[PDB]
Design a protein around this ligand. Structure first.
Ligand SMILES: N[C@@H](CCC(=O)N[C@@H](CSSC[C@H](NC(=O)CC[C@H](N)C(=O)O)C(=O)NCC(=O)O)C(=O)NCC(=O)O)C(=O)O
Length: 1444
């Protein structure tokens, strides 16, 4: 018991703690805490082993030990000052006896703490915090009792002792927290490391873990230079994927073998779940502290009313210190509420990083054991979506998982809180929510329907654009850009840009409907209160209630969204459980034994009439039967058989794929294998030869010289640095087979299985390989080798051979017996190089961003203010002003609604009843509805008038410029980068950029009106908000620069995880043939860890920002509450002013954070306008039309061509390729153009079509210089048979005449002349309206050539050019072309460019070209009669001279 006039009640009359509560509870629990935990920690640290790390003794530990020995002196002196009256009180005398033991424990613990730990001990940090707080409360408690009652409750001794006793504890706390221990001067050589430096999270004390201050070192670095992958720290302890997947495998395997009904989700839950049970505790404590602030607001308003009232009655007892203490509790609640929420976010964000790394690494190691058929059940492009999609949805689910119980909890607390203020009137708030929640969930479906519809038209536009960009060479010649531009423009304008406006309207209606509900609940609740209850509606019922209505906004929004992800994640679990249960290879299928010793040894045995099964299910199929087979060292063993017999099955047996039911098999030593179809990995040719082995130069050069590869390296003129694969340059033919054999031979294995490689190559090359590799001559003299082939030479040199058919062996022998006795279609047609060593493992190197940072280094804040003005002029600039005005109107009316509510409450309080309620209520309804209509109008203006006009303008501007670029742009730029801008960058401008400007401006005006409402009541708030603006700018500038570089460095690393999986899916027979599984798993795990070490600091920068921007809001609440109580003393404050001011300040803490988060979404998306405007201003070409010079309709009436000293070059920086050409062609003449390879023949037609400009001279046709003519009027008239045959989708009529200039009769006549009519009619009865698939898959190459000939047939002209078409048109078609030249084109002048001299022997005259100079121009007969002439020498090179 306490012998005191004030009891154990926590709150005194003056508003602070009673003395009995301070002494008996707060300063006792913090003593028992240290007694119980310090002994345990002291034991565990004393049992710990000695370690070599030692810290030097220094002033730190001397100071700590000096300070802690004064506390015992002050408690000692204070314990004698006790008077005779106080010693009969149990709670005060218990205090010193409880404290004095814990001081001795702490003094002991500092000593062992200094030597045996790296980080400041946690219990020491919390004990001194509690003991500073408990003593400061006692100092305040003595002061206010002195001031009001006039006596010292304890003499000046106890006061001055308490004053010293606070300062000593406060000094100990900071000497514990801030300084760091110096290491000894020696044994510090472990700092020398070239790798990344260790992560700073592992050495932070608990106060730095709570405030995230360990992250401040990276922000100063990223602010002053571009980050690159050499700056990132290592991952922490226990984040490695090899560690993580070995936990989950044990639980899943136990799940399958222990019990009858497995499931995957339970195995996931029981291993990672234990942290998400801890996250629920912090979520519940936050949800309880959130709903406390309206109770302190109710208490403060009622205190203002009582203090004004009794003073005014005294004009016609409560202390002022009670007002200053409530304003301090409103700061403490906000500080604790901030401190627990981000410890919830840390624990939920780490579990997604664990789940992703466990599942990805189990999927990869699963794929290496799937049998042939289960691997055949699905697409290679589809198993990769298990990584790209399915684990991504399981990652994103965890951030929402606790809201399934946290959502209803807040809404039940809110309804029960409103029940106590207002009574039975509350129930109208339930019915409106019951009506309007299903309507909103109904509206959320039709948007998803429209959004799924929108995604098709993207693909249709992308396909049309890609098909234009591939065939640009034909478009340039035929002047066909006019139909295809309109064909694209029709699809762009008349579907997609219609569908956008519909989606815009459906978004606007949903924004209105979601805005109006929390107003409508309050208006109906006040309206039902006024007409039924017999009570005055006063200020402290009205202004606390608004905050409780407004807290219902967030849980109503988020409840429908979490259900969608919960349904969506349920399919993915079933897909992964399907995948993990497939059938697996039989382990026992073949034995593996060590090497043989001597050349007589048998290497392999199969016998006892073994049988092997092609499949296990649904019915097993007999692959092999009665097999009895052997092989010996050294000798070449070959096997022959029909295609589709057991030939392939023996090789598949010896690799161990098939299922065994009878017999036995064994293989000695290592196996090297070559697949029949080659597999080429992405990399250098050097690495494809080495394939993970060490480098020995002599054996390497021997291996290359044993193959034809050396000349192939010489011909390409590029060494082993040439990239090869899918994205390298395309090798062809026997080169791949030669490369595969070169890979295999370098391994020096003890058994070779060769699956018929010789079919790909020349026969003399095969002879060369039989000289240098196979037989007794080559390097493989002592290795066993089995080659399955049908080659007569190989079976001639074979030492033993056997015949396999129908799955059974029928004959075998040496070939002498076969020649003599078999009468069969086989006739009736001691030392070696030691194994190469394996290279060692390590880490996968990163790339260097220097290649782009050298351009970026000229500035930071690299997006200029110009691009914002370019986008705001693509939008009509009046519409932006009309968009801005209505945000201000909407916020102004909402503020005036609450000023009217304040006036209504002040009128009700004076009367004690509710007069004129129907008059007062209608104006509040009007001001509340006029604020929703203004929110509707701005969204209609934004979607229909601002955005669609920009999306209309930009694409039309870009396409016109791209379609008129000269050929150099298309030759130098890879098409995979041109198509990206048409596909992704237009999409971000269409759908995502417009929304973030809305969410920026709507939140930015709200805090300006909030600060105006606060400053209008107490004008001294000016001096508070001005120094807080400088910190707000300081933090925003540090976050902006660093976060975008961390996001980019994340993004570039994510793709190479999946390319490796797609590359390895194609090669499982090779990888399993060389036993490279361990290396191929290790590469994948390094690829995962490189991504996670860049994803880890990205999410922690958000927590670092948010703690510091939410701490400003609590100082704003403290300052606004305190200045009103300073104003109350002057006698001027009233209850309505403090209610209106404090109801706004409590709602500001999230907006300050969301503005700075939206600034980076604006800056990320605005780059797309810069990249579009890059291509818009691209360089021009010569004019299409020159109006003053336009030739008559029939201008080429004579086919006469004249050269006037013409010269030209491909590019200005290169040499002249044609020089001083003077040539004259007679009308109707048939000219042969021929010359040596690379002499510059192809430039002639580009000069003729003016695709290249003149450097000197000119070309003249029929008394006009062609340089004066517009390019369309020039290129329209010529006729060309191009060497490239190119097909477009759509009708045959579109492929012949897309302009509809000509009748069907001419079309059918041309098709009749081209022999095409019979084939198309068999395809479809539609005739001309029959449609051709992409790339002309229905047409053979000869059909494409005949189609091009029909295209040339339809165009009337006096001139034709056969521009090198003989490079693809074979003689079986060229005979028809010759007949067509004799019959139809006979009247024309014809220029023919020859692939071979045989095709042009009927030429009237020939021009010989050599190195840009005219060699001779003479008749063929005079050349062929001059045996020493140049053309005669060319015919001798062609062999026609010797032929005749
Ligand atoms: N109070 C929140 C805590 C914060 C929170 O959960 N934030 C979200 C962001 S939702 S962002 C969605 C949006 N928020 C805002 O517009 C900001 C709040 C507002 N301006 C205010 O005045 O409080 C909204 O839903 N507005 C509805 C409304 O206007 O009432 C989150 O999970 N962030 C984790 C992360 O991303 O790291 C809660 O109860 O959980």
């Amino acid at each position: 018991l306490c012998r005191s006039p004030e009891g154990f009640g926590p709150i005194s009359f003056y508003g602070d703690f009673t003395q009995c509560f301070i002494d008996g509870v707060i300063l006792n629990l913090s003593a028992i805490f240290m007694i119980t935990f310090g002994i345990r920690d002291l034991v565990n640290l004393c049992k710990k082993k000695h370690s070599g790390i030692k810290y030097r003794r220094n002033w730190i530990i001397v100071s700590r030990m000096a300070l802690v020995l004064l506390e015992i002196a002050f408690v000692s002196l204070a314990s004698l000052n006790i008077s005779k009256e106080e010693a009969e009180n149990f709670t005060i005398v218990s205090q010193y006896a409880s404290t004095m033991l814990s001081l001795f424990v702490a003094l002991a613990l500092h000593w062992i703490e200094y030597d045996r730990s790296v980080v400041a001990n946690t219990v020491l940090l919390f004990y001194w915090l509690f003991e500073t707080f408990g003593n400061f409360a006692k100092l305040i408690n003595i002061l206010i009792r002195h001031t009001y009652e006039g006596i010292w409750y304890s003499g000046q001794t106890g006061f001055i002792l308490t004053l010293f006793q606070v300062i000593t504890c406060a000094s100990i706390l900071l000497l514990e927290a801030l300084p760091k221990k110096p290491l000894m001067p020696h044994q510090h050589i472990h700092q020398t490391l070239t790798r990344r430096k260790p992560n700073p999270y592992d050495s932070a004390n608990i106060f730095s873990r709570i405030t995230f201050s360990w992250m401040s070192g990276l922000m100063k670095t990223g602010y002053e230079k571009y980050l690159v992958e050499a700056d990132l720290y290592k991952l922490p302890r226990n984040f490695s994927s090899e560690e993580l997947s070995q936990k989950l495998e044990k639980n899943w395997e136990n799940e399958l073998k222990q019990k009858s009904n497995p499931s995957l989700s339970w195995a996931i839950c029981r291993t990672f779940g234990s942290k998400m049970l801890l996250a629920a505790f912090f979520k519940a404590i936050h949800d309880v502290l959130a709903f406390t602030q309206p109770q302190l607001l109710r208490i403060l308003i009622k205190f203002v009313t009582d203090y004004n009232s009794e003073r005014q009655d005294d004009h016609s007892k409560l202390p002022i210190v009670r007002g200053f203490l409530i304003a301090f509790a409103m700061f403490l609640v906000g500080f604790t509420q901030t401190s627990v929420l981000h410890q919830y976010f840390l624990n939920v964000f780490n579990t997604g990083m664990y789940i992703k790394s466990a599942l990805t690494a189990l999927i990869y190691q699963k794929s290496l054991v799937l049998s042939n058929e289960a691997s055949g059940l699905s697409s290679t492009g589809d198993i990769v979506n298990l990584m790209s999609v399915d684990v991504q949805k399981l990652q994103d689910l965890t951030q929402w998982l606790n809201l399934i119980w946290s959502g209803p909890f807040q809404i039940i607390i809110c309804l029960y809180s409103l029940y106590k203020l207002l009574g039975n009137s509350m129930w109208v708030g339930v019915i409106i929510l019951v009506i309007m929640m299903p309507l909103n969930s109904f509206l959320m479906r039709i948007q998803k329907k429209l959004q799924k519809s929108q995604m098709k038209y993207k693909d249709e536009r992308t396909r049309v654009i890609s098909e234009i960009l591939n065939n640009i060479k034909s478009l340039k010649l035929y002047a066909w850009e006019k139909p295809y531009r309109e064909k694209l423009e029709e699809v762009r304008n008349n579907k997609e840009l219609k569908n956008l406006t519909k989606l815009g309207c459906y978004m606007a209606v949903t924004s209105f409907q979601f805005n109006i509900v929390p107003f409508l609940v309050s208006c109906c609740t006040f309206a039902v209160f006024v007409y039924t209850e017999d009570r005055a509606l006063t200020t402290d019922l009205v202004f606390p209630a608004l905050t409780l209505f407004n807290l219902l906004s967030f849980p109503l929004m988020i409840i429908p969204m979490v259900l969608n992800s919960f349904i969506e994640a349920s399919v993915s679990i079933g897909r992964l459980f399907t995948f993990f249960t497939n059938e697996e290879l039989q382990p026992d299928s073949v034995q593996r034994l060590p090497k043989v010793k001597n050349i007589g040894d048998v290497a392999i045995n199969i016998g006892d009439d073994a049988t092997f099964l092609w499949q296990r299910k649904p019915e097993y199929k007999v692959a092999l039967k009665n097999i009895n087979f052997q092989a010996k060292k050294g000798n070449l063993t070959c096997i022959v058989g029909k295609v589709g017999s057991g030939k392939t099955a023996l090789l598949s047996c010896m690799l161990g794929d098939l299922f065994r039911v009878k017999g036995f098999a064994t293989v000695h030593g290592s196996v090297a294998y070559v697949s029949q179809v080659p597999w080429i990995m992405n990399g250098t040719v050097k690495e494809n030869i080495l394939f993970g082995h060490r480098y020995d130069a002599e054996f390497y050069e021997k291996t290359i010289k044993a193959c034809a590869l050396t000349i192939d390296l010489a011909i390409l003129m590029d060494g082993d640095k040439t990239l090869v694969g899918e994205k390298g340059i395309s090798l062809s033919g026997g080169q791949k087979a030669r490369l595969s054999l070169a890979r295999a031979v370098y391994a020096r294995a003890d058994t070779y299985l060769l699956d018929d490689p010789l079919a790909a190559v020349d026969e003399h090359v095969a002879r060369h390989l039989i000289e240098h590799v196979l037989g007794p001559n080559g390097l493989l003299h002592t290795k066993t080798k089995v080659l399955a082939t049908n080659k007569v030479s190989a079976l001639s040199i074979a030492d033993s051979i056997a015949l396999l058919d129908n799955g059974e062996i029928t004959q075998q022998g040496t070939y002498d017996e076969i020649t003599k006795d078999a009468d069969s279609p086989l006739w009736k047609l001691a030392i070696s190089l030691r194994r190469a060593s394996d290279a060692t493992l390590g880490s996968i190197d990163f790339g260097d961003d220097e290649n782009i940072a050298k351009r970026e280094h000229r500035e930071q804040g690299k997006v200029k203010w110009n691009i914002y003005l370019e986008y705001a002029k693509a939008c009509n600039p009046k519409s932006v002003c009309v968009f801005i005005l209505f945000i201000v109107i909407s916020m102004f009316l909402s503020v005036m609604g609450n000023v009217w509510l304040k006036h209504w409450s002040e009128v009700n309080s004076r009367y004690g009843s509710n007069p004129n309620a129907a008059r007062y209520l209608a104006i509040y309804f009007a001001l509340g509805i006029g604020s929703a209509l203004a929110t509707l109008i701005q969204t209609i203006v934004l979607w229909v008038f601002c955005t669609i006009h920009a999306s209309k303008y930009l694409h039309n501007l870009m396409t016109n410029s791209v379609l008129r670029a000269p050929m150099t742009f298309f030759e130098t730029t890879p098409i995979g980068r041109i198509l990206n801008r048409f596909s992704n960058d237009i999409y971000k401008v269409d759908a995502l950029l417009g929304r973030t400007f809305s969410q920026f401006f709507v939140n930015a005006v709200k805090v300006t009106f909030t600060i105006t409402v606060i400053c209008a009541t107490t004008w001294q708030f000016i001096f508070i908000i001005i120094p807080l603006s400088v910190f707000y700018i300081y933090y925003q500038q540090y976050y902006l620069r660093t976060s975008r570089e961390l996001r980019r460095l994340d993004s570039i690393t994510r793709s190479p995880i999946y390319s490796h999986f797609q590359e390895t899916l194609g090669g499982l027979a090779t990888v399993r043939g060389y036993s490279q599984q361990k290396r191929f798993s290790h590469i994948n795990q390094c690829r995962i860890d490189n991504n996670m070490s860049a994803f880890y600091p990205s999410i922690n920068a958000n927590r670092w920002l948010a703690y510091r921007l939410e701490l400003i809001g609590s100082i704003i609440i403290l300052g606004a509450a305190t200045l009103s109580v300073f104003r109350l003393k002057q006698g001027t404050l009233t209850a309505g002013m403090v209610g209106l001011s404090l109801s706004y300040a409590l709602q500001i803490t999230q907006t300050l954070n969301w503005i700075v988060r939206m600034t980076v979404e604006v800056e990320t998306n605005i780059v797309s306008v810069e990249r579009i405007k890059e291509y818009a201003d691209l360089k021009s070409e010569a004019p299409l039309i020159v109006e003053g010079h336009r030739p008559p309709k029939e201008w080429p009436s004579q086919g006469d061509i004249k050269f006037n000293n013409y010269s030209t070059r491909y590019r200005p920086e290169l040499d002249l390729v044609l020089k001083h050409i003077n040539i004259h062609i007679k009308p109707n003449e048939k000219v042969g153009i021929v010359g040596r390879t690379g002499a510059g023949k192809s430039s002639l037609t580009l000069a003729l079509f003016r695709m290249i400009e003149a450097s000197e001279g000119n070309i003249v046709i029929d008394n006009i210089a062609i340089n004066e003519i517009g390019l369309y009027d020039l290129r329209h008239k010529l006729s060309i048979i191009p060497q490239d045959s190119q097909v477009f989708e759509g009708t045959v009529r579109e492929n012949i005449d897309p302009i509809n200039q000509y009748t069907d009769e001419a079309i059918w006549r041309a098709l009749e002349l081209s022999h095409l009519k019979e084939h198309v009619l068999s395809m479809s009865n539609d005739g001309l309206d029959a449609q051709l698939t992409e790339g002309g898959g229905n047409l053979s190459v000869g059909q494409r050539q005949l189609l091009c000939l029909a295209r040339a047939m339809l165009v009337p002209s006096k001139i034709l050019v056969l521009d090198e078409a003989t490079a693809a048109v074979d003689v079986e078609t060229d005979k028809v072309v010759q007949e067509t030249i004799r019959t139809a084109f006979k009247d024309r002048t014809i220029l023919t460019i020859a692939h071979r001299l045989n095709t042009i022997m009927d030429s009237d005259r020939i021009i010989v070209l050599d190195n840009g100079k005219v060699a001779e121009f003479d008749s063929p007969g005079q050349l062929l009669s001059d045996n020493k002439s140049l053309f005669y020498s060319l015919c001798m090179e062609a062999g026609l001279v010797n032929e005749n």
